[PDB]
Design a protein around this ligand. Sequence first.
Ligand SMILES: Cc1ccccc1CNC(=O)[C@H]1N(C(=O)[C@@H](O)[C@H](Cc2ccccc2)NC(=O)c2cccc(O)c2C)CSC1(C)C
Ligand SMILES: [Cl-]
Ligand SMILES: [Cl-]
Ligand SMILES: [Cl-]
Ligand SMILES: [Cl-]
Ligand SMILES: [Cl-]
Lengths: 99, 99
Amino acid sequence: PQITLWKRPLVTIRIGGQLKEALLDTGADDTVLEEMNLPGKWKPKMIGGIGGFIKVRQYDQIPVEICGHKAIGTVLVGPTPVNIIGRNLLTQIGCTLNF
Amino acid sequence: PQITLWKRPLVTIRIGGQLKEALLDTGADDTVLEEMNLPGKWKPKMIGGIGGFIKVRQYDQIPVEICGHKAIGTVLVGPTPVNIIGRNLLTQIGCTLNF
Ligand SMILES: Cc1ccccc1CNC(=O)[C@H]1N(C(=O)[C@@H](O)[C@H](Cc2ccccc2)NC(=O)c2cccc(O)c2C)CSC1(C)C
Ligand SMILES: [Cl-]
Ligand SMILES: [Cl-]
Ligand SMILES: [Cl-]
Ligand SMILES: [Cl-]
Ligand SMILES: [Cl-]
């Protein structure tokens, strides 16, 4: 797809058995999902941006489908206000910024 | 250009006559720069990101050259972690996401 930026670039993703809406975010190094009771082993992490840092749970080798395109990698879970797909998974689906 | 995402998508901008490095950020509604001087009128504003809300100064109708392409729009100044080019100016230069 080609996605314009008039509005927030929200797409459907599949992760952990759930369909969700998530933000395609070239500013994010990694992927962070709204709080959910995902199974598996995890390790604690802090991530930071506008407003400071939040504590999240880091899960590894998690399958994610983004708009029909498959990926697998690290997913963070915690008190983000929006589900965010970052560069770690955007590169796996071939996404580029074009102008 | 077609910018892939293995590294942060940083580019050179010119604003107020000065050259700076900035991040092309599709997850940001607004353009937010580190502390600097800009000419003309401003008013206080609040924005929220991954960690919560911050106070910024809002400058309207500011020319910005981004990787060679002209934009003129709103620039926020305040305690951002990095210089951020958000959707308000990415749309002006014709940026889309592609995969
Ligand atoms: C988000 C994430 C995921 C994994 C690991 C670290 C991080 C933290 N990174 C970051 O926060 C990076 N940024 C990003 O990733 C931004 O795209 C951020 C994403 C977001 C969207 C809605 C709610 C909350 C956050 N958006 C904003 O901060 C944002 C949101 C709305 C208006 C506004 O003026 C701004 C600047 C902006 S600052 C940053 C370049 C460091
Ligand atoms: Cl849940
Ligand atoms: Cl297939
Ligand atoms: Cl990963
Ligand atoms: Cl700089
Ligand atoms: Cl604007």
